[PDB]
Amino acid sequence: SKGEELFTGVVPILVELDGDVNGHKFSVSGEGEGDATYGKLTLKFICTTGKLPVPWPTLVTTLASAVQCFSRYPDHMKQHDFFKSAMPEGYVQERTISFKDDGNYKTRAEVKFEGDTLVNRIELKGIDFKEDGNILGHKLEYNYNSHNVYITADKQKNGIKANFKIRHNIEDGSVQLADHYQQNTPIGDGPVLLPDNHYLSTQSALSKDPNEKRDHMVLLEFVTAAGIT
């Protein structure tokens, strides 16, 4: 597509999130870069309101949803890249993240170019969380397992849908499932690529900046599109 030409090099990324989980209000700011040619994303997130009331791993898919734009689509699959085709005008995203035996996050995001920078503005609303649950009780390990994002076309809405499962590791050795349902529609009136069924193979690594005293998260992600031969 035409929008793919904007991703041939290193693109700066800005992430801004406003959240409310069970009345606990917070804000997160993120800075980094993505290099789609290698399906690479590097981002550092900082909680600007103080301490994050939810564990950092629970916010990775939301805070770094722009990784979908940096997915390396193999040459034979390039006509299936919705994300880049929606650029520079961008897309609006909505998700419902359901934590098994706990609450849910409902998100609304806009991913678009502001000059040569890819900006992701997000609003997160979390309800029905248990006080001593895995989320509000901070019982999740600071790590991330590899996963696949299953994409299907939504022809009538001129966009896409996505479904995936995240398995957060609990400190006792168990797993906290987070079911994701996603919908994306373009902001602009220009033509976008409506894909055939495929998936985004994701690999993530969470770390800390040794010199950072604020509540933060450093993320390194690698994403490759697959599913079509």
From Swiss-Prot:
Keyword Cytoplasm: no
Effect of residue 202 to Y: Gives rise to yellow-emission variants. In EYFP; leads to yellow fluorescence, folds faster and more efficiently at 37 degrees Celsius and has superior solubility and brightness
Post-translational modification: Contains a chromophore consisting of modified amino acid residues. Maturation of the chromophore requires nothing other than molecular oxygen.
Effect of residue 144 to F: In Sapphire/H9-40; exhibits a huge Stoke's shift, with an excitation peak at 399 nm and an emission peak at 511 nm. In Azurite; shifts the excitation and emission spectra to shorter wavelengths and increases quantum yields compared to BFP
Stated consequence of mutating residue 170 to L: In R10-3; matures to the red-emitting state with excitation and emission maxima at 555 and 585 nm, respectively
Practical uses of the protein: Green fluorescent protein has been engineered to produce a vast number of variously colored mutants, fusion proteins, and biosensors. Further generation of mutants led to more stable proteins (at 37 degrees Celsius for example) with brighter fluorescence and longer fluorescence lifetimes.
Variant or mutagenesis effect after changing residue 68 to M: In Citrinine; leads to excitation and emission peaks of 516 and 529 nm, respectively
Record keywords, A-Z: Chromophore, Luminescence, Photoprotein
Effect on the protein upon substituting residue 68 to L: In RSGFP4; increases fluorescence and shifts the major exitation peak to 489-490 nm
Effect of residue 170 to V: In EBFP1.2; shifts the excitation and emission spectra to shorter wavelengths and increases quantum yields compared to BFP
SUPFAM superfamilies hit by this protein: GFP-like
Effect caused by changing residue 166 to V: In P9; increases fluorescence at 475 nm excitation. In R10-3; matures to the red-emitting state with excitation and emission maxima at 555 and 585 nm, respectively
Consequence of substituting residue 144 to A: In Cerulean; leads to improved quantum yield, a higher extinction coefficient and is 2.5-fold brighter than ECFP
Pfam families in UniProt: GFP (PF01353)
Resulting phenotype, residue 166 to T: In P11; increases fluorescence at 475 nm excitation and at warmer temperatures such as 37 degrees Celsius. In Esmerald; leads to brighter fluorescence. In VisGreen; leads to brighter fluorescence
Effect of residue 68 to H: In P4; leads to no detectable fluorescence. In mut2.2; shifts fluorescence lifetime from 3.03 to 1.94 ns. In mut3.3; shifts fluorescence lifetime from 3.03 to 1.88 ns
Family the entry assigns: Belongs to the GFP family.
Known role: Energy-transfer acceptor. Its role is to transduce the blue chemiluminescence of the protein aequorin into green fluorescent light by energy transfer. Fluoresces in vivo upon receiving energy from the Ca(2+)-activated photoprotein aequorin.
The protein, known as: Green fluorescent protein
Gene that encodes it: GFP
